[PDB]
Amino acid sequence: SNYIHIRITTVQGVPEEYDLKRILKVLKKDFACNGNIVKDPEMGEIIQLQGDQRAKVCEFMISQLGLQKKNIKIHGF
Amino acid sequence: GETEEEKRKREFEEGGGLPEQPLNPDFSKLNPLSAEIINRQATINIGTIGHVAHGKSTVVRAISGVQTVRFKDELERNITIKLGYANAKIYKCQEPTCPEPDCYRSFKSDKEISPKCQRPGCPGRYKLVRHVSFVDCPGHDILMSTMLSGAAVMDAALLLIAGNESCPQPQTSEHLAAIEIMKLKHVIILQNKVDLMREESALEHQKSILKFIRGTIADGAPIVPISAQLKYNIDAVNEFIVKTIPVPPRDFMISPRLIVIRSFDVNKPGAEIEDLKGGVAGGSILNGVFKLGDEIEIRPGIVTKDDKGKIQCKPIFSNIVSLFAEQNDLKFAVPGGLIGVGTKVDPTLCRADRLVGQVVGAKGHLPNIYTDIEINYFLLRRLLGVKTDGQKQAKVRKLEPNEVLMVNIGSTATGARVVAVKADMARLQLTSPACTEINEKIALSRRIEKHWRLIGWATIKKGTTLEPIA
């Protein structure tokens, strides 16, 4: 399992080996985009990203934490 | 228009069914090959050894048909900690016309004493040459104590080697060395993979295996190609088991004992507790005959710590309510077979891993629990189970004082502290209770690369007794 995906933008599905606020700090600078760490009523992790930059967050988890890069699915939307 | 179950029932009744064990038969005449012993209980234990990600439970399942569970969700796939059990019956065709290689036929536990032959054209039936028990042992680099215990229980060996991987795999060498440690030479080498291979790759692998076994203890060990998925060439393995492996000396003279390796509780959930069952200790009897309704005590038993740090041992007396062997409840037990003693021992004492390697003695014997033991140790040169990337497979160093080392005395898995070091002898201090009855075969492992690693063999010479608290 451990399904990770990006939906037009938001990233839902995040393993927590690294801190989520640290995730905000390593996203916000490079991406220059607004990001909201919102706790939905008991779904996976929610992190926002304004403007469609799905390939950019692909590059991002490539840089920071991505280790499988096969279950991450680029949604159409 | 008979249903398949009806046809099987007709074949079962035609085959004589399965006669019940006598309540009180003459034991001075009973042999492991007697008809009454052989029909409903196994007399020889056969264990399988191999490297990880090869498949041993598959071969055992193909030989017999008894499934090996592979439980605990996470362990359903990777590796199992508890041993695997499977009952197989050696059935040989009585008709001379049919070829010898396919005469033998291994069946499962509840088959009749004489099933019909499945080869087309032979109206003959099968005769029960032997009932064999199978003790699947783990072959991972982490789980050794269970494998050493089951190999101590083991009396006959089946080594599994697959061809397409590296010829000198270390795990099989380690298991063969362990078997060589504990007085066991009847080893049958089996090729796991033959189908996906070329006719010369198999020959090269066979040459490699022959080169491997030239200087070890076992010399005339046969090699047999087998399949775990296609389910062929199983009768040949049965024939080799019949021919190569005789009955180890096991008569009724020696005193009764029990070596429990698995603890099983019988508490079916959802059912009201009004109708329950006693707790089951899964133990091997290598010496003695056990009968229904006997008084028995677990020797190491209740381990407790006093407020002063002293270790108190309370032997666990209990009455035997049942002795489950093979498929049906039986009246008497045969040494050389893994039997579940279902006694009135509290079910929580048989919950998960409490009676894993514990000695148990029937009322009428006085084993000895020891705190400090004297051991005679003999070492090996190169550590087995390690793939060194081109530089001198690790040389075993001499032991040092005060090191926690795993001293698997038969089935007991304990970490002992060394108090004395010399050329051959060592004093082992045991924080966990261990007991000695006659000799006990022992394996030694150290912690050099994280997980436990075998170094050599050991034999108890003396010990400091702890008198039971009644």
């Binding site: - | 399942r61 033959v194 006719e199 005339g220 046969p222 090699i223 047999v224």
Partner: protein, 134 residues
């Protein structure tokens, strides 16, 4: 003595050559019809007999993967919308990798039985017993 070893190995090779002259590929190209607004797959039962699966389980999975639950007719599944044909080729290949073909061995005849409450995956060449139902 390794003399009784080579005979059994040659017998095994002869048994292989008897059973498998080719050394699975009995998976037909999917045929989906696009009637403008209605997508019809009349190949579900043919692949049911070409994969040895229970058609009810095939249909329940094919509903559980998308946001659709069409109609069963006869040997065919009916849905009313705009959809492609490559999608179910990929679906079939993944489903083959997970259920139709056992990961451990190359065989199709393997199928789903119930030994608890869930579905247990079992084989037909050997009889491997795992829990593959999600």
């Amino acid at each position: 003595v390794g003399l009784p070893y080579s005979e059994l190995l040659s017998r095994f090779f002869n048994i292989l050559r008897t059973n498998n002259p080719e050394l699975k590929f009995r998976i037909p190209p999917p045929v989906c019809l696009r009637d403008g607004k209605k997508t019809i797959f009349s190949n579900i039962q043919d692949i049911a007999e070409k994969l040895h699966r229970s058609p009810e389980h095939l249909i329940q999975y094919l509903f559980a993967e998308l946001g659709t639950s069409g109609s069963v007719d006869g040997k065919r599944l009916v849905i009313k919308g705009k959809f492609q044909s490559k999608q179910m080729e990929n679906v079939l290949r993944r489903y083959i990798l997970e259920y139709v073909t056992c990961k451990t061995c190359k065989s199709i005849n393997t199928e789903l039985k119930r030994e608890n409450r869930l579905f247990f995956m079992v084989c037909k060449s050997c009889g491997s017993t795992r829990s593959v139902s999600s």
